[PDB]
Each structure stands twice: as C-alpha cells, then as structure tokens.
Amino acid sequence: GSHSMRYFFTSVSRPGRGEPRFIAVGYVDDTQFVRFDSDAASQRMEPRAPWIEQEGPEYWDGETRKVKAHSQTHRVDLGTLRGYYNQSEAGSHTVQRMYGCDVGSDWRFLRGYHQYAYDGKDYIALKEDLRSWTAADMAAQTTKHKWEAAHVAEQLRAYLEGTCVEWLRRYLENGKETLQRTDAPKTHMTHHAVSDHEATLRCWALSFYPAEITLTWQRDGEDQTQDTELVETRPAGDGTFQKWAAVVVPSGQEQRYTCHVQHEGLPKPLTLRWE
Amino acid sequence: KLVALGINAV
C-alpha cells in the first residue's frame, strides 16, 4: 500500500574521547538501504540494500558530502544546546533527527515530517503544514526564531514535497523485487504447561514483511485480553520480522482459545488453534 | 536522497 522514506541521525558527544559519534541510517518502509557511521573506516555513505547499488559514484559522493554536513552541523548543535540548557561540558549528550516523506499506494505525496530531539526529548518539529514549528521548550524558541527567519521550513518543504517523493518513487521502482513484496507470516503455536493447573499457549508469527501485524486472542470467539501478553515486533536479522502473543489457560480448555493473525501478506486473516 | 538545503545549526 502506502510507502515512506525516512532518515534517522544520532550524534553522541564523548567529551575528551574524540569527536561526537555520528550514525545515519536511511529506510524505505521497513528496509534499511544506506548507512553512515563516523567510527567506520570508509567515511562514506554505504549501501545496505541491493537496489541502491545501481546508483553511480556521483550519488555516493553527493550523499557522503551531504551526510557530513549533517554530522558537522550536529557537532556544532551539541555545543549550542549545552549552552541553551546551561549544562556542563562534562558528560555525554545526544542529538537525534528524523525526517522523511510518505506516499500512498499510487505513490502520491501524503505527508512529510522533520523532527529533532535533545537528550531523548522533543526539541523542535516541523508541523504538518510544512510551514511552521512546534518548539518544546523555552530553549527551543530561540531555534524556532532563527529557523523561521532563515526559512528552514520553506527549504525542507521543497525537499519533502519534491525531491524526497521523487527519489522514494525511484527507489520503489529500482527495488520493486524486494520493496514491493509481502512476506506472509509463517505461523504456528506452542504450548507449555506452567504446572498441572494451567498452561501457556504461544501464538507465533515469523518471517513476515512489512513489520505491521496484529495478533489477538479469543476465548469462545470473544476477544480476550486480561491475561494476555504480546512482545514488541522484532527483526529476524534477514530482513523479515517476528512477533508472538501468548495466554495462560486452565488446561483442558486450550480448545476454547484461538489466535487471529492479520497481515498485509494474507488475503484472509488466519485463525490459529492448538494442535 | 538526503537533504541538501535547510540543515541549519540550532
């Protein structure tokens, strides 16, 4: 259906022990396709998905040039933010930045975003009009004033409505084989007696893509939550995702329970029972 | 494709 391109940046000061650590990663949907790590040997943007490797050296020089501009600007920002918040040069602080754009099934522009954080809290963010800013703090108002006056929103909006969307479409095209795919979950269920009184049914979904999924339990066809549990969706390490949900049941009652699985890769949702 | 314009110091 809908798609996104997103870049994630983290800068971490390590005072005395060198320049800040800087990590950039780019995603299309739930697939990483590029990375930059300041402590890696190449000092270049590097590919992480097959289809981006057909971009030529001009692309790789360009992305490397730009990503360094991101890095060196964050390095300045770390000093600035320390000042804004009257913090010691002792100790480590973090700048994070995320931006990107969403397009629909027909690849039309849906929205854009550009969010910035300091020490893991909202600092400033571009609103949905792609024209104005939400500043979290009194400190962030200074940034908001500067960026207003310097028309940062105008520059970012041009990217988010234009370049971002155009290159996302290019990427979706070039990596159709693997981005425009669904991997339906492989499911199964496991049962572990917690004693003689009760047991645990575990509903598994494995090897699915994209990450979006929903697992729910039912008792006698009615939605059960009170003694459920559901882990955070997790990467398998091969490009697909895993998730499970479990429930504890009095034994000789397992057959009362069904697990329901919904995923883009399934024409119909699955109903699972203990076998 | 990364942003080329609008990365400004805070």
Epitope: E58, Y59, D61, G62, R65, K66, K68, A69, Q72, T73, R75, V76, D77, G79, T80, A150, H151, V152, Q155, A158, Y159, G162, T163, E166 | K1, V3, A4, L5, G6, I7, N8, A9
Partner: T-cell receptor
Framework: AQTVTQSQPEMSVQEAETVTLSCTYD???????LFWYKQPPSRQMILVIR??????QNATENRFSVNFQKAAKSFSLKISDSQLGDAAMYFC?????????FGKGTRLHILP | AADIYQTPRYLVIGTGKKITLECSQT?????MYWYQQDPGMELHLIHY???????EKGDLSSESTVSRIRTEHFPLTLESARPSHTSQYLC??????????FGPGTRLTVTE
C-alpha cells in the same frame, strides 16, 4: 561533478546595450541555490541575484535578470541597458548547505 | 554596508613568517568561509565553519589553520608564508544555504 562553468573569460558590451553572461553547472542534486556575484575594481564581492532551484519564476533585480533552465542546468545572467559602472568580474555560483562553489568568472568590459 | 570586517586591508610579509588574517562579523551569522582569490581571479575555498567549534578544511592550503571559538571571529593563520600565498583573501559569513556576505578582503603579498 559539482562544477560551475563560465566558458567566456572576457566579454565586451557597448554602453546602453544588453549583454548575456553564460553559465552552466553540474551537480548530483536537485535541491540547491544558484547565484551571480559582481566584483568591481574595489575587489568587493557583491551579490547580484539569488535563485532557488525550487522556484519556477526567474529572479530579477532591476537591470539584472537570470534565465534559469534547470533541465539544461543553465543559469545565464542578462544585463540590460548596460552602464559603465557595470564593468566588473561576474561570478556564477552554486550553493548547498555545505558551501558555495564559484565559476572561474567572466570579466565584463563596457565600451563607452 | 555589511558588518563583516577584515584586517589588515593590505599586507606585505617575508617568506617564512607566521601571519594571522583577521575576520570578524557582528551579524550573528552561524556560518563563515575563507576563499583565496589568486591572480586570474578564481575563488578557492580554504576553510569554512558551520558554527562555533566547527573548522572544516577546504583545499590545498599550504598550510593554514582557522579557529572558531566564538560566533564573531574566524581568524586565518598561515604558518610559514610562501610566495604562492600572495593572493586576495576573502572572508564571508552565511545564514543557512543563502548568499554569502563577503568582507572587503585582505590583499597579501609574500615577498622573497
């Protein structure tokens, strides 16, 4: 290649006539700004025109105007009704967040 | 007008001398740049800066350094002047990716 090309290092124009200074560029990018600077005998770099790549209207400042042709990556500067005070170096230039890159410059003489 | 200042305006020094060219701006601009303009009038980027504590290398500067401990000041130091340092040195400040604002320049001659 991140280059700015001004192929004519010198040009002359009769006073009160119009001249076009040519400039093309190469870049991996679609988001950038373009500029023309004037540097008179004083050697002071002076901004003539700025053009945003995402703006379709051509920048104009009095007698100076640009012909921004993004698909051809061409960025001519037209000087109409040329004045003696127009005599200077003219630099075409390309900008992103990181830096501005300047062409080699064109010396414009005005024949009184 | 433009509030970016370079000193000295003119300088002649002997080969081997360590020299600092001053550049200061009180406009609150975060970014600053140094360009060497050789005879022939090409502008070559030497150093630049995204803000305080940022000192980014440009090209074959033989072998200069900059400091940026405060917004206002971006001094350029030549450690051991050479005759090839004979040039016009142009300092510029900048807001985001917009036009650079150049100071008036320092005209440096390094004599044998």
């Amino acid at each position: 290649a991140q280059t700015v090309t001004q192929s004519q290092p010198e040009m002359s124009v009769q006073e009160a006539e119009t001249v076009t200074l040519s400039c093309t560029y190469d870049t991996s990018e679609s988001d950038y700004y373009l500029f023309w600077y004037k540097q008179p005998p004083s050697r002071q770099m002076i901004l003539v025109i700025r053009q945003e790549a995402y703006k379709q209207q051509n920048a104009t400042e009095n007698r100076f105007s640009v012909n921004f042709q993004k698909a051809a990556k061409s960025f001519s500067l037209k000087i109409s009704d040329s004045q003696l005070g127009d005599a200077a170096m003219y630099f075409c230039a390309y900008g992103e967040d990181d830096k501005i890159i300047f062409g080699k410059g064109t010396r414009l003489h005005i024949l009184p | 007008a433009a509030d970016i200042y370079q000193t000295p305006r003119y300088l002649v020094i002997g080969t081997g001398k360590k020299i600092t060219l001053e550049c200061s701006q009180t406009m609150g601009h975060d970014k600053m740049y140094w360009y060497q303009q050789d005879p022939g009038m090409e502008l070559h980027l030497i150093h630049y800066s995204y803000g305080v504590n940022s000192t980014e290398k440009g090209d074959l500067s033989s072998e200069s350094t900059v400091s940026r401990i405060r917004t206002e000041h971006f001094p350029l130091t030549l450690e051991s002047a050479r005759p090839s340092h004979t040039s016009q040195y142009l300092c510029a400040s900048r807001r985001g990716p917009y036009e650079q604002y150049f100071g008036p320049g320092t005209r440096l001659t390094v004599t044998e």
